[PDB]
């Protein structure tokens, strides 16, 4: 079967250097293009350059040339992305692709964040209810990406959203979650947010309920 | 280079509709012209290669015609999988370019939004900073207006809010939009409120609390 594995994601400051790599298997590694491809966050695909790794024939989309070096380890079936000072504008997801002239394969991504930030971990504060009520939690503080939030250690998926994390100015990310549940279960149900944010090892247990005076 | 423009930007659309996008090209690509979904989290996935030929695996409902600068991407009638952002790329030229993408949402009846307003935790006041909170629950279109009013004063720049994904049972979506102050701001106010304008609501809705009271 032929495929393209990407390395695994990576958390960044700016200035650092970084390589990522692209393996294929399945088929001979030296006989087909290798193109990489940049997404960046909310945004849609560019072409970043490409290189035939026989005999490492490389071309770069002009907006990349002298940004970033693509190469290739012949012996071992890889290709790969280099950096030798990152930005925080280098934030992104890369795709590698396999590209045939005569890009049906493409590996499944290597997400890439660059931030000044330091790892840290959220706070978790209630959002409080006052026959539907809502109630939830607000996670807020961290970084890097991602938490992760259930409700009553999995007991409780129905009405759950969890929403997608904001950065903030600071460079910390803040996400919510939030259920909602009939209004006469206040009382005699309970509700409990667990939270983890496996970067900063912090986890966090919050039971929510209706805030009394 | 070659500049690929993709519309409309969102399609919607209901299951069993007919779906039909466009890219055109800056000049000429002849007919060296692919089509790729994505969905969320995933790599791009090649549908239509050289304008107007399926790749293999993809089902007959996608076709593709046009050559020279005009393209369309017609899917004859959409099944739940369809909904996703469609690419269209040209193989021209050097540099490969893509398009900006076309969304491609789920069509279903308009929601009005429930609305939840949220007043900031003690626990979090202790610190320094206020996060008040409002939630806007299950609405369909995804085009909302969230406006934090304190003491009446319209709020701009101080909030930030997410959206969720479409939602694989109903169709619908789901907004938080959050209200940062410093804690010495929060203490000076009395009423704070968001106000939520959507196609669903006759009129904007307002949930509101006054600070410290029950």
């Known amino acids: 079967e032929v495929q393209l594995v990407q390395s695994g994601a990576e958390v960044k400051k700016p200035g650092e250097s970084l390589k990522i790599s692209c393996k294929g298997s399945?088929?001979?590694?030296?006989?087909?293009?290798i193109g990489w491809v940049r997404q960046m966050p909310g945004k849609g695909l560019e072409w970043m350059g490409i290189i035939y790794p026989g005999d490492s024939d490389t071309r770069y989309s002009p907006s990349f040339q002298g940004q970033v070096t693509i190469s290739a380890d012949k012996s071992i079936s890889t290709a790969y992305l280099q950096w030798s000072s990152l930005k925080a504008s280098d934030t992104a997801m890369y795709y590698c692709?396999?590209?045939?002239?005569?890009?049906?394969?493409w590996g499944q991504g290597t997400l890439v964040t660059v931030s000044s930030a330091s790892t840290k971990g959220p706070s978790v504060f209630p959002l409080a209810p006052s026959g539907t009520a809502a109630l939830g939690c607000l996670v807020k503080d961290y970084f890097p990406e991602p938490v992760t939030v259930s409700w009553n250690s999995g007991a409780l998926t129905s009405g759950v959203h969890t929403f997608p994390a904001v950065l903030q100015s600071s460079g910390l990310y803040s996400l919510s979650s939030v259920v909602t549940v009939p209004s006469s279960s206040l009382g005699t149900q309970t509700y409990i947010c667990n939270v983890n944010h496996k970067p900063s090892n912090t986890k966090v247990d919050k039971k929510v309920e209706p805030k009394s005076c | 280079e070659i500049v690929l423009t993709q519309s409309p930007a969102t399609l919607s659309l209901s299951p069993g509709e007919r779906a039909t996008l466009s890219c055109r090209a800056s000049q000429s690509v002849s007919s060296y012209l692919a089509w790729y979904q994505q969905k969320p989290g995933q790599a791009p996935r090649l549908l239509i290669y050289?304008?107007?030929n399926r790749a293999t695996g993809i089902p007959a409902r996608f076709s593709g015609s046009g050559s020279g600068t005009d393209f369309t991407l017609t899917i004859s009638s959409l099944e739940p999988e369809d909904f996703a952002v469609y690419y269209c790329?040209?193989?021209?030229?050097?540099?490969?370019?893509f398009g900006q993408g076309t969304k491609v949402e789920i069509k279903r009846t308009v929601a009005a939004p429930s609305v939840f307003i949220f007043p900031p935790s003690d626990e979090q006041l202790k610190s320094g900073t206020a996060s008040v909170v409002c939630l806007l629950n299950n609405f369909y279109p995804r085009e909302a207006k969230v406006q934090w009013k304190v003491d009446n004063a319209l709020q701009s720049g101080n909030s930030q809010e997410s959206v969720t994904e479409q939602d694989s049972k109903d169709s619908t979506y789901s907004l938080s939009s959050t209200l940062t102050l410093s804690k010495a701001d929060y203490e000076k106010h009395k009423v704070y409120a968001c106000e939520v304008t959507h196609q669903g609501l006759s009129s904007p809705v307002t949930k509101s609390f006054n600070r410290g009271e029950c």
């Open positions: 399945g088929y001979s590694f030296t006989s087909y293009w």
């Open positions: 692709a396999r590209y045939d002239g005569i890009l049906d394969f």
């Open positions: 050289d304008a107007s």
């Open positions: 790329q040209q193989r021209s030229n050097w540099p490969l370019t």
